[PDB]
Amino acid sequence: SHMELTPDQQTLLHFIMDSYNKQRMPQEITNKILKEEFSAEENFLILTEMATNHVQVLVEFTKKLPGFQTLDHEDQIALLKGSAVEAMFLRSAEIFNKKLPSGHSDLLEERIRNSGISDEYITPMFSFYKSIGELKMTQEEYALLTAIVILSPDRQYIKDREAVEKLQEPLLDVLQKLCKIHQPENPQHFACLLGRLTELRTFNHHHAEMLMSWRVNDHKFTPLLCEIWDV
């Protein structure tokens, strides 16, 4: 029973999965990946559209996490802003690894490597994608890991860090159990998942540097992205 979810944990897991499965990528965007013109300009604009959708989806997923809307309102904002980049990279890794057809993923990578973005930041992104892929996580593990990243008591400007920690700890307990259910032969699996959260945190710096570099034809970001990234 150290590896069996209690009824309340199973209810919590269903609730997180419902919220996680609710929204995916709009076909408008996946269609553009496939048929839009190929240029550094077009590719950068698709990637900003994808990022804007990522933020929208993340807000909606986060609002439905149990307890989140009971938190102080400024802390809610602080969590959404603090987690945005890590959650984007985690989501985009899943999309690249598991949610797109082969060919969609091939063309998306080709567009990523030809969008005016420096290889200094593209190379670690694809290294992380493969590093996450190696873990061969289930959808449940991805969803729980994402909620753990979002509900981090360590983000800047949180007023009531204990309240966030109380929300995050049940998710960690669930994920521990999920690792023993889904990879029973690999006892280090849960530690490996948290080890990847360390690499994931390197993208706060990577993203901040990328924002300082050139932007194809010096194109701008959407208002929402400017706001969540403090541009």
Partner: peptide, 13 residues
Amino acid sequence: KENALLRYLLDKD
């Protein structure tokens, strides 16, 4: 206000 767009999305049913 600060973070107007994020607050819009957070408080929008």
